């Protein structure tokens, strides 16, 4: 079944920004630069930060990192391995609805916020029909991902800060923590103090 | 983000006028105290683990319900996340201290953090309490005069304390 | 032999080219044919200007004063050979060129590099050329009266590693061995040192992805260490070599040549992606199982 | 607002790291440069009007057609002359901002970003602004570190315009 | 390497089939066209130096940057390699015309030629322009009305034009 | 490999732009620090062996059981004592490298990355190494910019281990 | 990447020993050269558009075949791609100058560039010719005696020239 | 959470297919193991206090310094002993949870995930908890499938710690 048609919305990423490199330009972590082992660590940690916000060493995938270091796989393949990892399924898939899993997939794969509720609704059926890896591969092979980050660059929040403004949009790791109020009340939180 | 110089630059550009003599002298005074700012940043950075750890232990001693089973700091993963959050808040106030302006701390760490902690059930008041303990440990570290050139660091300490209470208010 | 892939490679013109032998009591056409074959093969299909022709060596070969082998030796020892192949090349490249010209095959291992570089350094270029020509391999293959020719087909003492390296040294019929993409660089230094092979990429006529060459560093390895795990569920992994990547433009495109290990289930999508970026597929090799 | 301080913070934040001695050394270099940058800004500010007026005449002298032919993009009338003086004043004021800041960030976000389509849409020749910036270089009367830093900003603008 | 007959043979052998009646009749039609093919081969061959020299002269006239110092056809060695290239391409077009199949062209003449031209810095577009000059000259020579038995050589001319196009496209 | 020069170039290269005055000030800060770092490394190198022997003894004093408990992970024999002295020497040598390089790059490259796995699988207590670094801080006998830069590297190692 | 200091550091750790006094002394001499290096970086940077445009103009004057139709620098996008490449090569040359090591130039710029250019048909010899023209222009900018403190920059000039040579050898 | 039933449904859900015979066999294996796991959990629960006291005391015997030197991470005071007995109880209680669930999932979600961060932050040697778990190994008095499953969980914790 084809994806539902949903209208786009005005976004910074959809429009030409005339960007000049500055402190608010996201760092381009790319393997095209022949990175040393410490610079490779920085790239790997950026991918962990992009995908898992933070990665405890229980959440790390040392085999995936070794494959990325050796050139076995691309940066996009490493991003896919992070999304298919146990950490991502438990934190972001299991503890959220399908609609709030599409967000946390659009936000950190495409580097942009979801257009509307309709986009979340349209893409939420993909997990249950084409499989979990089906959703991951559709977003990674999309023209948006490839035109923006390609194979060798870690994705990032695109066009978060406009020039001259003190504050841009909220970072997606702040805007959308791993779980929402739904899993919050299943856990019994919030706790009363004193 | 903005730093101490660029904040005045952004205000001046909005008014469309050159920096006045008084504003340039104020920035010169800022440069004059820049060594104090750098070593205060260095002192907090070199004691980051101790500041985070002591504050966390103090918080769980004063609020045992955080660590009893069912608490938001109970289990190793939640506890490590709490420690991580302490360290993140500390890292961003050092960033704010380094720039001399609170734009990076607000834009990258604080803005929307209250909603994040509401969405997760993290008690924001207790996070604020932890940040106050971090402030106390960090100000003691910045202020001891052992192994450093003597001077008046009251202005930078007041700036650091302002960043810390800014963090505590944002998470509350 | 090579039948289906002969035209794809540059092997087809040499499949119907019989070895050029100078029979005893040869005619004048026979002598001239040997001269043409030796110039083409020993000098690697370079155009030979009239001022560069070795008139005396040709006369001696015509007269029977020297044999085909001695004429090959004279051509290989000439200043003409040395300007084309010795004076501007790293000696490993000189060894590669000697094996291609005097023996019609690629070097097999680093031991040959060791022997020839030591012999050149200890006794000179002329002594090194003699070892190629006085070798047992030369005598059994060409002997005294046969012009050396490319030995594409399998033989008695071959290694298949030599067959792969032949197409690193040979780049087509209308190619001249000084007019190749790597220019003066040694084509086999990394390969002989590591005892590895590269996927065979055919010449520019029949192969769209002919221009693919791996970079100095940041190259995708041949085999897929890790299996299908980084790709979720996958059946088999394939290494695809892609050349002429230009469409997105810099900085999106850094290197125009890229090797990717992709699963079977993404091969269709990979082909479309190559088409959008304007690239050409050089080779596809099984990378797993 | 690219400055030494914001980039040091940006570099540390992109790696999720505290501020090491590398960032501290970045700040020390900023402190070494800052007093010269501030004094350069004051010197340009006090001489801003004469620099702007002289720059307009240098552009007018080198491109006399700008003061002759009619058109919205030319300075044949008082309206065009006022627009030109305002643009050169914009360039001079933002260079002082860059001297204060310690980076090209003020030029980057107030002027340089998008200036190409600004010049193209309104048919403004970038060579005009190049000559205005060249005059500012020749007549700002700076020396030492202040001159080097100010000329770096001015040549950054000239390079972006050419 | 194939000709018009062996090309049909190779395709049939891969399919494992006997040549059909239509294929035999088509080859019979090719045989009936054989005299005109031989005349075209002989005519191009007989005027080969004139074809090559005039086309080269025309090419250097409208592309003088080729022959000025530093140009790729400057110095007698390069100019002569250029002339040899033109004659070789013309010769292989006669080969292809003779066999009735293009295989001798792309198996030998165009096999690795583009790698040669890219590696040497030879302008492939200029070589293609020269090949077009030989094309127009050679087609006029083949279609020369005088000194030959009258008939229709349009099919042979189209085939020769195709061989010349293959050569030009292989280098452009 | 973190170092102000490499970091400045990486930031500029990520932005795809030429080095500006911001990166020049980064280099100026590196130049201001580099000499003091070099004599810090020289002084640490000259007093390397005594500091290492002293740090081993300080660790053995604070954790007495390491010298009287059998097991591969302790220093109750000469093999354990040699490996302990070797580890402290590695820390000291890489700290000198950081002082030479002007950043924590040598520590990250050679010692910090993967040290937790090492201390865990070989059940080595990171508190031992923290105490060794603490003794080195107390006894390296540096002053001024040298002391400050050196203590930043030693505290970076301590923070990584704690 | 490596700079001048980390290259010496890396060799020492591979060998596993403290830096000797001679290596420390060599690094001190490099530090005393630091201001000249920053000036050279700034002078090449400040004239970057002029260096690239004049070098390109001279290159297309000496090699008109590049900009004639069918040439590789012909058509506006290819012409734009050429100019951008010259600027990129120049930019990475200044990076190598800034770090004091060619690792950034080799790893990030020259890695695969020879292979890239032959895959696209870009004539590498002409790119090398263009790199030379930028090279003489930039060394003249670096050695300009007007408006700068007196001294001998011959070591920096030789080092910058070496970086250009690497760039020109790599692309050819 | 790693448990045979949860993993069976998770893997069937992740590719959007109904529960085939493979997940049925997984459930059959879970049913075979379930009674032994429940009996093992009850046995470990019944003398949980004796098990915890003996394991904590065993840690004190192998590590007497933990009860002697003063420190927040040590059990010199009653506070520290209470924290230690509480920690061993958490380990043992979660092990009983794993026995009930049929997989290491309760250990993964409650204890293992971010245990590393904790031991380092609070200077808790993982070797301490390893000896406690080895006491639970040697003194649970289980047999057959109950011993085998319980030992697998305890060795899983040991392998994670060491
Ligand atoms: C309040 C925060 C405390 C304090 C600070 C203080 N520091 C200085 C002076 C300097 N501090 C430095 C710092 C460093 N040197 C380095 O190389 C590095 C490593 C990267 C650092 C962090 C420097 C360079 C100076 C100047 C030289 C000097 O040693 O004096 C002062 C003096 C005034 C000034 O701003 O220069 C002061 C006041 N002093 C206290 O009493 C507080 C406990
Ligand atoms: C188009 C190619 C032109 C053309 C050709 C044409 N030729 C013939 C006929 C013949 N031509 C030959 C050729 C040769 N005889 C020789 O001995 C040699 C040298 C070895 C050659 C090249 C022969 C034998 C014939 C048949 C007898 C005859 O002389 O006529 C025809 C007629 C039809 C046919 O195919 O036989 C044609 C059309 N004529 C044109 O008008 C074109 C310009
Ligand atoms: C006992 C073997 C040794 C020992 C124990 C000890 N532990 C702590 C502190 C903590 N222990 C934990 C562990 C957990 N919390 C959980 O929720 C779980 C998973 C369900 C585990 C495994 C944590 C998080 C802490 C820190 C928070 C707290 O204050 O409790 C201490 C105190 C450390 C301190 O600095 O206060 C001690 C003493 N001590 C010994 O000497 C024994 C050998
Ligand atoms: C400790 C003082 C208190 C505490 C903390 C706590 N936090 C979380 C979880 C998260 N915290 C964040 C924080 C940030 N997102 C950002 O982008 C930034 C930096 C720029 C911050 C500060 C996020 C996103 C999460 C959720 C994702 C994750 O944890 O990986 C937890 C864990 C809750 C959970 O199950 O995720 C905890 C325990 N809790 C207390 O009880 C203390 C008062
Ligand atoms: C038979 C089971 C399958 C098969 C085989 C097949 N092989 C070739 C051609 C060659 N085989 C080799 C292999 C080697 N050369 C060596 O020197 C060594 C030993 C050291 C090996 C193993 C080579 C290099 C060739 C090509 C050169 C030559 O054949 O002389 C062919 C011929 C292919 C062709 O004609 O193009 C065939 C058919 N084919 C099948 O279908 C079987 C599955
Ligand atoms: C000595 C200071 C260091 C060293 C040297 C070393 N080199 C090799 C091997 C080779 N060296 C070359 C060199 C050249 N080839 C050429 O064409 C030219 C001249 C134009 C040169 C300089 C080659 C090709 C080889 C390979 C062949 C051979 O092995 O002889 C070795 C041996 C490598 C091996 O493992 O076999 C060695 C030892 N090694 C050191 O440790 C010194 C720092
Ligand atoms: C100018 C002097 C010469 C010239 C250049 C030319 N280059 C291209 C295309 C590309 N050049 C690159 C190069 C790089 N990629 C890197 O990563 C780096 C180092 C960091 C460099 C310099 C790339 C990737 C391309 C392809 C994509 C793109 O165009 O952006 C072209 C266009 C070729 C085409 O077919 O479109 C040209 C014209 N041409 C000459 O003739 C000069 C000698
Ligand atoms: C002076 C060198 C030449 C000249 C000037 C001229 N400029 C305009 C119009 C505009 N100038 C700008 C430029 C800026 N605006 C900004 O905010 C900044 C950055 C802070 C800059 C550099 C813009 C945007 C415009 C158009 C909008 C506006 O009117 O402000 C004009 C008028 C063009 C028109 O169509 O009205 C003129 C005449 N004219 C000359 O002849 C001089 C050589
Ligand atoms: C060498 C190619 C040419 C040369 C160089 C040279 N420069 C100096 C001195 C300095 N140059 C600077 C540089 C800057 N100051 C700034 O504020 C900026 C912008 C951020 C820059 C680029 C500095 C700070 C100095 C030191 C103080 C001074 O003004 O002299 C020297 C002198 C020795 C030294 O290394 O300091 C030299 C030799 N001089 C030539 O003649 C060459 C053409
Ligand atoms: C003058 C002595 C007599 C004369 C000259 C003449 N020459 C040509 C054409 C060519 N001349 C050359 C020569 C060279 N080109 C080189 O690159 C070099 C080496 C550096 C040399 C010596 C060549 C190659 C040509 C052909 C290509 C070209 O035209 O440039 C012509 C034109 C001939 C033609 O067919 O167009 C003429 C007229 N002719 C006389 O009668 C003079 C007495
Ligand atoms: C002339 C129209 C253009 C031109 C040509 C030119 N070509 C070369 C060099 C070579 N040409 C070939 C081509 C062939 N050799 C063959 O054997 C075959 C048939 C199978 C072909 C098609 C080869 C292989 C070479 C290299 C050999 C050699 O000795 O050069 C050059 C010489 C380049 C140089 O000397 O550097 C030239 C000049 N150049 C132009 O400008 C014209 C557009
Ligand atoms: C000394 C403070 C205490 C101590 C030491 C001790 N260490 C080991 C074993 C290892 N130490 C390391 C550490 C490093 N290797 C490196 O390459 C670097 C980075 C440059 C470091 C920090 C490693 C990896 C090992 C294991 C392998 C090896 O032996 O090198 C042991 C022996 C452990 C064992 O044999 O299993 C010991 C005893 N012991 C004490 O009691 C001191 C308090």
From Swiss-Prot, chain A:
Q: Name one GO biological process term.
A: photosynthesis
Where in or outside the cell? Cellular thylakoid membrane
Look up the domain of life of the source: Bacteria
Coiled-coil region? none
Provide the alphabetized UniProt keywords.
Antenna complex, Membrane, Phycobilisome, Thylakoid
Q: Pinpoint the PBS-linker domain residues.
A: 9-186
Q: What is its main location?
A: membrane
Family indicated by similarity: Belongs to the phycobilisome linker protein family.
Function of the protein: Rod-core linker protein required for attachment of rods with the core of the major allophycocyanins in phycobilisomes, plays a major role in light harvesting. Although able to transfer energy to both photosystems, this is predominantly a PSII antenna. Involved in state transitions.
Quaternary structure, from the entry: Part of the phycobilisome, a hemidiscoidal structure that is composed of two distinct substructures: a core complex and a number of rods radiating from the core. This protein is part of a conventional PBS rod (called CpcG-PBS) with on average 3 stacked phycocyanin hexamers (PC, CpcA and CpcB). Linker CpcG connects the PC stack to the thylakoid, the hexamers are linked by 1 copy of CpcC1, 1 copy of CpcC2 and the stack is terminated by a single copy of CpcD. Ferredoxin--NADP reductase (petH) is also part of the complex.
Q: Any idea what this protein is called?
A: Phycobilisome rod-core linker polypeptide CpcG
Q: State the organism of origin.
A: Synechocystis sp. (strain ATCC 27184 / PCC 6803 / Kazusa)
Gene behind this protein: cpcG
UniProtKB/Swiss-Prot annotation, chains B, E, G:
Record's comment on post-translational modification: Contains two covalently linked bilin chromophores.
UniProt KW keywords: Antenna complex, Bile pigment, Chromophore, Electron transport, Membrane, Methylation, Photosynthesis, Phycobilisome, Thylakoid, Transport
Q: How does it sit in the membrane?
A: Peripheral membrane protein
Listed under GO biological process in this entry are:
photosynthesis
Localization of this protein = Cellular thylakoid membrane
What residues bind (2R,3E)-phycocyanobilin 1, as annotated? 82
Q: Which residues carry this modification: N4-methylasparagine?
A: 72
Main location as per UniProt: membrane
Tell me a GO cellular component. phycobilisome
Pfam families attached to this UniProt entry: Phycobilisome (PF00502)
Do you know which InterPro entries this protein is assigned to? Answer: Globin-like_sf, Phycobilisome_asu/bsu, Phycobilisome_asu/bsu_sf, Phycocyanin_b
Give the superkingdom in one word: Bacteria
- Gene3D superfamilies of this UniProt entry? Phycocyanins
Q: Which residues bind (2R,3E)-phycocyanobilin 2?
A: 153
Q: What does this protein do?
A: Light-harvesting photosynthetic bile pigment-protein from the phycobiliprotein complex (phycobilisome, PBS). Phycocyanin is the major phycobiliprotein in the PBS rod.
Quaternary structure note: Heterodimer of an alpha and a beta chain, which further assembles into trimers. The trimers assemble into hexamers, although these were not seen in the crystallographic studies. Part of 2 PBS rod complexes, the conventional CpcG-PBS rod and a photosystem I-specific CpcL-PBS rod, both of which include ferredoxin--NADP reductase (petH). Interacts with rod linker CpcC2 via the latter's N-terminal PBS-linker domain.
Q: Which family does it belong to?
A: Belongs to the phycobiliprotein family.
Q: Which protein is depicted?
A: C-phycocyanin beta subunit
Q: Which gene specifies this protein's sequence? A: cpcB
From Swiss-Prot, chain C:
Which InterPro entries does UniProt cross-reference here? CpcD-like_dom (IPR008213), PBS_linker_dom (IPR001297), PBS_linker_sf (IPR038255), Phycobilisome (IPR016470)
Name any Gene Ontology BP term.
photosynthesis
Q: Source organism's superkingdom?
A: Bacteria
Gene Ontology CC terms, in alphabetical order: phycobilisome; plasma membrane-derived thylakoid membrane
Domain (PBS-linker): residue spans on this chain = 1-178
Fetch the Pfam families from UniProt.
CpcD (PF01383), PBS_linker_poly (PF00427)
Compartments, as annotated in UniProt: Cellular thylakoid membrane
Q: Where is the CpcD-like domain?
A: 235-287
Which keywords does the record carry? Answer: Antenna complex, Membrane, Photosynthesis, Phycobilisome, Thylakoid
Q: What does this protein do?
A: Rod linker protein, connecting hexameric phycocyanin (PC, made by cpcA and cpcB) rods in the phycobilisome (PBS). PC is the major phycobiliprotein in PBS rods. Linker polypeptides determine the state of aggregation and the location of the disk-shaped phycobiliprotein units within the phycobilisome and modulate their spectroscopic properties in order to mediate a directed and optimal energy transfer.
What subunit structure does UniProt give? Part of 2 PBS rod complexes, the conventional CpcG-PBS rod and a photosystem I-specific CpcL-PBS rod, both of which include ferredoxin--NADP reductase (petH). CpcG-PBS has on average 3 stacked phycocyanin hexamers (PC, CpcA and CpcB). Linker CpcG connects the PC stack to the thylakoid, the hexamers are linked by 1 copy of CpcC1, 1 copy of CpcC2 and the stack is terminated by a single copy of CpcD. The CpcL-PBS has on average 5 stacked phycocyanin hexamers (PC, CpcA and CpcB).
UniProtKB/Swiss-Prot annotation, chains D, F, H:
Instruction: List the InterPro entries hit by this protein, alphabetically.
Output: Globin-like_sf, Phycobilisome_asu/bsu, Phycobilisome_asu/bsu_sf, Phycocyanin_a
PTM notes: Contains one covalently linked phycocyanobilin chromophore.
**Any one cellular component term from GO for this entry?**
phycobilisome
Answer yes or no on keyword Disulfide bond: no
Q: Which residues cross the membrane?
A: none
Keywords, sorted A to Z: Antenna complex, Bile pigment, Chromophore, Electron transport, Membrane, Photosynthesis, Phycobilisome, Thylakoid, Transport
Subcellular location(s): the record lists:
Cellular thylakoid membrane
Q: How does it sit in the membrane?
A: Peripheral membrane protein
Sites where the protein binds (2R,3E)-phycocyanobilin:
84
Q: Which GO terms describe its biological process?
A: photosynthesis
User: What superkingdom heads the lineage?
Assistant: Bacteria
Q: What does this protein do?
A: Light-harvesting photosynthetic bile pigment-protein from the phycobiliprotein complex (phycobilisome, PBS). Phycocyanin is the major phycobiliprotein in the PBS rod.
| Subunit field text | Heterodimer of an alpha and a beta chain, which further assembles into trimers. The trimers assemble into hexamers, although these were not seen in the crystallographic studies. Part of 2 PBS rod complexes, the conventional CpcG-PBS rod and a photosystem I-specific CpcL-PBS rod, both of which include ferredoxin--NADP reductase (petH).
What PANTHER family does the record point to?
A: C-PHYCOCYANIN ALPHA SUBUNIT, PHYCOBILISOME 32.1 KDA LINKER POLYPEPTIDE, PHYCOCYANIN-ASSOCIATED, ROD 2-RELATED
Q: Which family does it belong to?
A: Belongs to the phycobiliprotein family.
The entry's protein name is C-phycocyanin alpha subunit
Tell me what organism the protein belongs to: Synechocystis sp. (strain ATCC 27184 / PCC 6803 / Kazusa)
